[PDB]
Amino acid sequence: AAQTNAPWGLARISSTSPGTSTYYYDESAGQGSCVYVIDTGIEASHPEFEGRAQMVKTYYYSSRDGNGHGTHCAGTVGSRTYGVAKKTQLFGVKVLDDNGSGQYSTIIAGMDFVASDKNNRNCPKGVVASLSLGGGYSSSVNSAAARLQSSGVMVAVAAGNNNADARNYSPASEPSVCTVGASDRYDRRSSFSNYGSVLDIFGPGTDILSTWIGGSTRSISGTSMATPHVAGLAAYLMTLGKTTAASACRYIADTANKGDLSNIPFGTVNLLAYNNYQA
Numbered sequence: 567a568a569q570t571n572a573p574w575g576l577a578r579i580s581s582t583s584p585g586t587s588t589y590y591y592d593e594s595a596g597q598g599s600c601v602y603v604i605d606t607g608i609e610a611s612h613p614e615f616e617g618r619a620q621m622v623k624t625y626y627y628s629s630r631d632g633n634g635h636g637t638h639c640a641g642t643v644g645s646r647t648y649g650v651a652k653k654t655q656l657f658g659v660k661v662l663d664d665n666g667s668g669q670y671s672t673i674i675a676g677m678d679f680v681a682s683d684k685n686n687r688n689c690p691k692g693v694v695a696s697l698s699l700g701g702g703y704s705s706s707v708n709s710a711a712a713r714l715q716s717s718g719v720m721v722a723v724a725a726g727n728n729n730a731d732a733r734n735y736s737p738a739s740e741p742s743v744c745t746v747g748a749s750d751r752y753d754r755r756s757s758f759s760n761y762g763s764v765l766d767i768f769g770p771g772t773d774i775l776s777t778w779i780g781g782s783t784r785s786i787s788g789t790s791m792a793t794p795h796v797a798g799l800a801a802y803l804m805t806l807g808k809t810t811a812a813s814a815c816r817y818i819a820d821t822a823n824k825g826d827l828s829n830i831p832f833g834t835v836n837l838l839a840y841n842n843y844q845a
């Protein structure tokens with residue numbers, strides 16, 4: 567398939583060069599996979615989700631996304647126009663309130679919920695969780711991420727937006743999950759992106775157009791936007807049978823565009839997510 571005038575991030579993950587605007591991808595489009603977006607919620611009624619999104623859990627007074635952040639992430643995973651895996655199933659878990667904040671115990675509770683909830687769901691091609699959140703180092707938050715990964719879910723988490731070593735943030739610092747840094751449309755590390763040996767991969771994270779609440783759209787920046795590119799790519803690759811939940815992060819690293827990013831510090835991988843789609 568080929569989406570012309572795609573958001574630059576989608577085009578980027580299907581090219582060996584920056585500056586294209588066509589997203590080339592296999593038409594299976596992540597059908598049969600499921601991605602849990604653990605965030606502020608998802609506006610499931612947004613037309614861009616085509617009825618493929620649903621809230622399954624909230625930890626607050628409402629299931630609604632009163633922020634937009636979770637809807638934006640969910641749109642980069644699997645919305646029609648802005649999504650990597652345009653036929654995946656999306657499940658919303660609201661661990662962050664409408665200001666984008668969440669306590670660590672609630673985040674941990676949400677991760678354990680997904681590890682069990684995925685046994686209620688028909689996801690024959692496998693299950694992904696995208697966690698565009700984090701905070702200061704916590705061994706309990708890391709273990710929760712690791713438990714989710716161990717249960718059979720491909721966990722992708724944001725490196726963080728502190729322009730610092732992500733070893734000091736969680737779940738970013740958990741070695742067994744996929745930690746995602748952010749890049750811009752000129753293949754530079756995003757100015758805010760964390761770095762460090764704990765990063766496994768970079769994805770597009772600066773000026774990312776996606777769905778927003780109120781049936782709208784907007785462009786925002788963050789490792790929070792890079793994370794769902796990788797989560798959507800994993801769901802897409804697991805639908806193609808090229809990898810599994812346990813190996814997707816390694817597989818994405820192995821097949822990444824290598825050495826193409828600038829302003830990567832020594833000790834941080836120079837790997838940019840890439841679908842290697844050959845039409």
Ligand SMILES: N=C(N)N1CCCCC1
Nearest residue numbers: 567568569570646647652
């Ligand atoms: N609007 C979407 N989802 N597109 C546009 C053109 C081809 C397929 C992807």
